[PDB]
Design a protein around this ligand. Structure first.
Ligand SMILES: [Zn+2]
Ligand SMILES: [Zn+2]
Ligand SMILES: [Zn+2]
Lengths: 64, 114
């Protein structure tokens, strides 16, 4: 029983989910999003930093 | 004239708990991380949490800090507190953002409980 890093709600123990370190996001609802511009990153290029993900180098630097 | 003092700047996705749908939801109605400050009015020694969306600077939280705010560090990256209306949540970008905000919150409460 895990909590989503995107929406802070439970992820169903049975379903498949996005994982990076001790972070998990829902893979079906819009939770795996660029922390800056909210772009859905499922299947996309992404740049993880602790609990955040981008998108692009532009969104990343915007959050320095 | 003396503008309010920002005593911390953390990155968090600001959230509220939606009771009717028994889940957490984004504050202001949309996803995205915010820059979250504690502002200190040095004239009166009053404090508030102010959070502005990183993409467009939409204000999603503007919350006074009372003497005796119960600040709940629920997880290492998720902290929360309530008032009579809402439960506010901060989903930090990292443990460092969280610890930095919590220290500023305790400093605020230090001054408020003097
Ligand atoms: Zn989610
Ligand atoms: Zn999607
Ligand atoms: Zn982005």
């Amino acid at each position: 029983a895990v909590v989503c890093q995107g929406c802070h709600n439970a992820i169903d123990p049975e379903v498949q989910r996005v994982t990076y370190n001790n972070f998990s996001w829902h893979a079906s609802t819009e939770c795996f999003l660029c922390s800056c511009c909210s772009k859905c990153l499922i299947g996309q290029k992404f740049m993880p930093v602790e609990g955040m993900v981008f998108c692009s180098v532009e969104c990343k630097k915007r959050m320095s | 004239r003396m503008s309010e003092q920002s005593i911390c700047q953390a990155r968090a996705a600001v959230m509220v708990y939606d009771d009717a749908n028994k889940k957490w939801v984004p504050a202001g109605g949309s996803t995205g991380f915010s820059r979250v400050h504690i502002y200190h009015h040095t004239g009166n020694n009053t404090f508030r949490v102010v959070g502005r969306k990183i993409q467009d600077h939409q204000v999603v939280i503007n919350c006074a800090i009372p003497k005796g705010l119960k600040y709940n560090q629920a997880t290492q990256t998720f902290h929360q507190w309530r008032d009579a209306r809402q439960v506010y949540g901060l989903n930090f970008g990292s443990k460092e953002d969280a610890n930095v905000f919590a220290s500023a919150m305790m400093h605020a409460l230090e001054v408020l409980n003097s």
